[PDB]
From a paper:
Here, a series of new methods are presented based on the use of a low X-ray-background film as a crystallization support and a photoablation laser that enable the automation of major operations required for the preparation of crystals for X-ray diffraction experiments. In this approach, the controlled removal of the mother liquor before crystal mounting simplifies the cryocooling process, in many cases eliminating the use of cryoprotectant agents, while crystal-soaking experiments are performed through diffusion, precluding the need for repeated sample-recovery and transfer operations. We have previously shown that the transfer of crystals to X-ray data-collection pins can be automated through the so-called CrystalDirect approach, which relies on the use of a thin, low X-ray-background film as a crystallization support from which crystals are recovered by excising the film with a laser beam and attaching it to an X-ray data-collection pin. The CrystalDirect system enables the automation of sample mounting and cryocooling and can contribute to closing the automation gap that currently exists between crystallization and X-ray data collection.
Femtosecond photoablation lasers, such as that used here, produce little or no collateral damage to the sample owing to heat conduction or shock waves. This property can be exploited to separate individual crystals growing in dense clusters or to eliminate flawed parts of a crystal with surgical precision. A series of ablation experiments performed on thaumatin crystals confirmed that the effects of ablation do not propagate through the crystal. This approach was applied to the analysis of crystals of the catalytic subunit of the human phosphoinositide 3-kinase Vps34 in complex with a specific inhibitor. We used the laser beam as a surgical tool to cut and extract a portion of a rod-shaped crystal from a cluster of densely packed needles. Helical X-ray data collection performed on this sample on the ESRF ID23-2 microfocus beamline resulted in a high-resolution structural model providing insight into Vps34–ligand interactions.
Numbering used by the authors: 286 to 416, 439 to 451, 471 to 869
The structure:
């Protein structure tokens, strides 16, 4: 059945929709009517499967015939199929089948999301792969369209130690989730079962695979002791100076604790890095009443890898935000735009605790209290006689680019609660944000601005009249156009976090993807979208 040119155009309009537009009944009947003609368009499948009422068995059987005939879909479109809209096991098996096609570098960037996608999988299939229960005991307690998702994730994790590490911790944290346990116990089991299947699949494996399981256990052991240590510190009476002496005391006793000297284990935060232990003498606590701890790991090479370990806090929102920023930055760099971003690593070792890579830097606030100005600061540490305003070209260039990158990205992610506390600067010129407590348009104060600039950022570029500021403008709109090309991917990825119990998403799960989708101004053309960003910057700077 071949549609006439007038409708072919109408079909094209429909397929051009954001994966998050809800098609009308008229619109579905039309896409359904010409489903066979649409088979050509990889792009059209997703909208086709939106046209099906999966509760009608014959309609599902019918749809599934086509799936097997359709131009096969992209990787980025497959993440649409693993969301909650789709319970149909054949569909979800079709999605996994096209994710197989992706490289592990790419899987990693969506893995946080895919672990959530487990929630929509078939719990009976998962459990019957096996051959009250503390999730963290499982690895430490070893017994002496064909694939679903669980099988696939484990199969790939068995071949790739980096992937396995994240799979392991992402699932632990899903197991640890108190809310899921009370409100969806069956889901809690599904995750226990996944961990047990992972544990099981490792032990079945060859020499190298089995060692991966020892490693994962050693890490979980490591973290259990760190946690215990932190509790001891957080109960210690008296001033912070006194509470530091306890943290250092305990790290240093390897009999009791085992934390200063160990056989090389992957760092859970960045498992490419392996670590001999924590250096006791330099451990300290931040001022915060939560008492997160700064801690220098000795790496394999005798380098230092400082982290923050937070105990009593849920890092999952922050984890997500840095996972996204990381992906945004990979994408930009694929399109040859390296904005000197600081996608620092975040990893939750539980709902109650986790790690953060600690980047050597100075809060802009401190920069003010010590050197008066971002430019003065740069003239102290990165002086040049030839360079702009007394400052090394490279340093200013880095600063302009990163200023632009965050400006866009923090706008797109509606990151609020911004202060000179959260805004950090690097003697190499790198500017970056931290502490993502409020996102997607929340803020402690009312009427938050949509663009997150300030007098101090602008001044360090040399005011609105400088060559730098023009380059800033230019890098923003350019970054905005690049990120718009990936709106599909980014939107699918947030779309998989609706049940993830991320505070700012769990207010209005139903309504969060649109919050992000609106920032992209997908209604505007690229050229119009450039003038939108320039407007935005103008308003902001005028206030
Ligand atoms: C330096 C100090 C003022 O900053 C506050 C430290 N700090 C913090 N540092 C982060 N950085 C990660 C990236 O490298 C830099 C540090 C990330 C982050 O989320 N936070 C949250 C608030 C406080 C703390 F201590 F309570 F956790």
């Amino acid at each position: 059945l071949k549609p006439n040119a007038a409708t072919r155009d109408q079909l094209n309009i429909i397929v051009s929709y954001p994966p998050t537009k809800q098609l009308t009944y008229e619109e579905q009947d039309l896409v359904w009517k010409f489903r066979y003609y649409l088979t050509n368009q990889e792009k059209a499948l997703t909208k086709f499967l939106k046209c099906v009422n999966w509760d009608l068995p014959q309609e599902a059987k019918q749809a599934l015939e086509l799936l097997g005939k359709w131009k096969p879909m992209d990787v980025e479109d497959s993440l649409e199929l693993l969301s909650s809209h789709y319970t149909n096991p054949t569909v979800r098996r079709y999605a996994v089948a096209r994710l197989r096609q992706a490289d592990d570098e790419d899987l990693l960037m969506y893995l946080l999301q895919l672990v959530q996608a487990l929630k929509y999988e078939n719990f009976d299939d998962i459990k019957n792969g096996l051959e009250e229960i503390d999730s963290s005991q499982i690895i430490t307690s070893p017994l002496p369209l064909e694939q679903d998702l669980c099988t696939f994730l484990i199969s790939r994790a068995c071949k790739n130690s980096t992937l396995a590490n994240y799979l392991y911790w992402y699932v632990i944290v899903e197991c640890e989730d108190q809310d899921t346990q009370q409100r969806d116990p069956k889901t809690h089991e599904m995750y226990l079962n996944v961990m047990r299947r992972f544990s099981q699949a490792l032990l079945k494996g060859d020499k190298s695979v089995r060692v991966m399981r020892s490693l994962l256990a050693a890490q979980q052991t490591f973290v259990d002791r760190l946690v215990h240590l932190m509790k001891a510190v957080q109960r210690e009476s008296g001033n912070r100076k006194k509470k530091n002496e306890r943290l250092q005391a305990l790290l240093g006793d390897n009999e009791k604790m085992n934390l200063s000297d160990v056989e090389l284990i992957p760092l859970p935060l960045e498992p490419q890095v392996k670590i001999r232990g924590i250096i006791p003498e330099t451990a300290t606590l931040f001022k915060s009443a939560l008492m997160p701890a700064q801690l220098f790991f000795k790496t394999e090479d005798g380098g230092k890898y400082p982290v923050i370990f937070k105990h009593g806090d849920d890092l999952r929102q922050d984890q997500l935000i840095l996972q996204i920023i990381s992906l945004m930055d990979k994408l930009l760099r694929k399109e040859n735009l390296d904005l000197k971003l600081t996608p620092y690593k975040v990893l939750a070792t539980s709902t109650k605790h986790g790690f953060m890579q600690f980047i050597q830097s100075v809060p802009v606030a401190e920069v003010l209290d010590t050197e008066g100005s971002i430019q003065n600061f740069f003239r102290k540490y990165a002086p040049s006689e030839n360079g702009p305003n007394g400052i090394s070209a490279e340093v200013m260039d880095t600063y302009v680019k990163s200023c632009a990158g965050y400006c866009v990205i923090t706008y797109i992610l509606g990151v609020g609660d911004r202060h000179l506390d959260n805004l950090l600067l690097t003697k190499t010129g790198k500017l970056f944000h931290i502490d993502f407590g409020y996102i997607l348009g929340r803020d402690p104060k009312p009427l938050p601005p949509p663009m997150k600039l300030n007098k101090e950022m602008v001044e360090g570029m040399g005011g609105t009249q400088s060559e730098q500021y023009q380059e800033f403008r230019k890098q923003c709109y350019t970054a905005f156009l690049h990120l718009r090309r990936y709106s599909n991917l980014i939107l699918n990825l947030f779309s998989l976090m609706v049940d993830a119990n991320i505070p700012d998403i769990a207010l209005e799960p139903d309504k969060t993807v649109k919050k992000v989708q609106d920032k992209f101004r997908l209604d505007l053309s690229d050229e119009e979208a450039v003038h939108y960003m320039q407007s935005l910057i103008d308003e902001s700077v005028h206030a």
